[PDB]
Amino acid sequence: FVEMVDNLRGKSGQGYYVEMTVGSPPQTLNILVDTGSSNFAVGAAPHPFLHRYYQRQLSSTYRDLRKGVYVPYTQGKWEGELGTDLVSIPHGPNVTVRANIAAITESDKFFINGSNWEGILGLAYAEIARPDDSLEPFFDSLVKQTHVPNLFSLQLCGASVGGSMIIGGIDHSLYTGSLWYTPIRREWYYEVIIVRVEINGQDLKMDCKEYNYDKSIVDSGTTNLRLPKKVFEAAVKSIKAASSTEKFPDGFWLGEQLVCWQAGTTPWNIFPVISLYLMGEVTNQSFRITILPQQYLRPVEDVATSQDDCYKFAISQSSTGTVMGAVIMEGFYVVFDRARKRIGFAVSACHVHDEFRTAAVEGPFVTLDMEDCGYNI
Ligand SMILES: C[C@@]1(c2cccc(NC(=O)c3ccc(Br)cn3)c2)CO[C@@](C)(C(F)(F)F)C(N)=N1
């Protein structure tokens, strides 16, 4: 695992990527690590924002599957062709496998100027793959073709950023304290259940199904903590109340506007900690992960504003359920234990903290109310 430590890079708010190769001879590409999708998709034609791309004509191991694929997102979209080829992760396991690849030949508002990644590694399950669930995801192919155990872990680190993706096991050097597990409720997204939410120690006091309307997921491919409208508004109310000695424009709370302080003077202490209690592996037991403002206030690097430290509010409203994105995962060691259908959280070597507060994973907590917090079945 020591060879795999620090195999992730990123620019703050642009995404964490890992080096991969595709084809024979190998073509090196930087690839976004995305637990929120299930396609391995790489740019395969020139694009103004692509510094390099997959050239299939140069790979004699490429096989054309003779099927197109169209993938729309909320913002942006791309079209491509399906095929398979040899894929490896130079700073991952010492293996090369054959995997499905979506070769992206045309796109719109997809490739981000300056992000440094040229494709996406979708690490979730076949159920949400495009065009349909018959297209085996990369990790499934990896496990089937090699002896690698069916789990990976992600240590995403804040700040230029970095981290580790450990495939096939748990690296104890990357966390301290206990590792706490929450069940994967359904294998499509990495879906989990939130049973309680506190802001500065105060329970939001909602029916816990509200926290998971209509699903909750762990998604390295999303930046923000995204919350259902009802939960979002209650969270903003509590955070505003705690930070009321300073008032910010409406646009800040919507994520449309930056707030800045003279470098080094960010008033971290007027912003509350957020605790998300996740369903435990034992009935009505839970554990909490605690999120500091150093996490949910996302710094925006810009040389022009660099006399200050400036931030975006990295909590936003969702109409498709809760998303625990990178700002939630950062500072934690997160184990995607597919083999045992559970996700583990532990305090990471690069967890956030200041002289008064620290990110934490704590348990067990017991709750008398026996309501099932799942929204659907
Ligand atoms: C495939 C998809 C996607 C597509 C294009 C870009 C991105 N991600 C980022 O650029 C980025 C930036 C900063 C940080 Br930190 C993490 N990631 C994600 C579709 O969109 C979601 C966000 C979803 F959930 F809608 F499916 C997802 N996970 N993967």
Work out how many domains the chain is built from and give that number.
Answer: 2
Residues 161 and 99 in one domain: no
The CA distance from 44 to 109, in Å, is 16
Residue 123 within a domain: yes
Residue 282 within a domain: yes
Residue 97 within a domain: yes
Q: Where are the alpha helices (DSSP H) in 129-228?
A: 138-145
Phi then psi dihedrals of residue 354, to 5 deg: -130, -165
Specify the residue for token string 């259908």.
Answer: 341
2-24 core/surface letters (b: 16 or more CB in 10 A; e: else): eebbebbbbbebbbbbbbbbbbe
The answer to whether residues 108 and 134 touch, using CB atoms and an 8 Å cutoff, is no
Residue 185 within a domain: yes
Cis peptide before 214 (omega within 30 of 0): yes
State the DSSP H helix or E strand holding residue 182, giving kind and residue range, or none if neither. Answer: strand 175-183
Residues 225 and 362 in one domain: yes
Residue 6 within a domain: no
Residue 127 within a domain: yes
Q: What is the DSSP letter of 32?
A: E
Q: How many CB atoms lie within 10 A of CB 68?
A: 12
Range of the domain at 69: 16-148
Closest CA to 116 of 67, 178, 51, 164: 51
Closest CA to 316 of 328, 332, 301: 328
Contact partners, residue 372, CB within 8 Å, separation at least 6: none
Which listed residue (219, 302, 337, 354) is catalytic? 219
Residues 351 and 269 in one domain: yes
Specify the residue for token string 């690296």.
Answer: 171
**Does the Cβ of 331 fall within 6 Å of ligand 1?**
no
What is the SS3 assignment for 230? helix
Residue 8 within a domain: no
250 catalytic residue (yes or no)? no
Protein residue with its CA nearest to atom 11 in ligand 1:
15
Residues 135 and 167 in one domain: no
**Does the Cβ of 38 fall within 6 Å of ligand 1?**
no
Residues 135 and 220 in one domain: no
C-alpha separations of 344 from 167, 194, 234, 260, 295 in Å: 14, 14, 27, 35, 19
Domain boundary among 120, 148, 176: 148
Give the mutation target among 32, 75, 127 for probing the ligand 1 site: most ligand atoms within 8 A of CB.
32
Residues 333 and 197 in one domain: yes
**Does the Cβ of 15 fall within 6 Å of ligand 1?**
yes
Residues 210 and 357 in one domain: yes
**Sheet architecture: strand order including 322-324:** 191-192, 216-218, 322-324, 225-228, 315-318
Q: Which two tokens stand for residue 192?
A: 């989990």
> Resolution in A for the shown PDB structure?
1.8
C-alpha separations of 227 from 152, 155, 184, 319, 325 in Å: 26, 23, 19, 8, 11
Residues 188 and 133 in one domain: no
Residues 138 and 215 in one domain: no
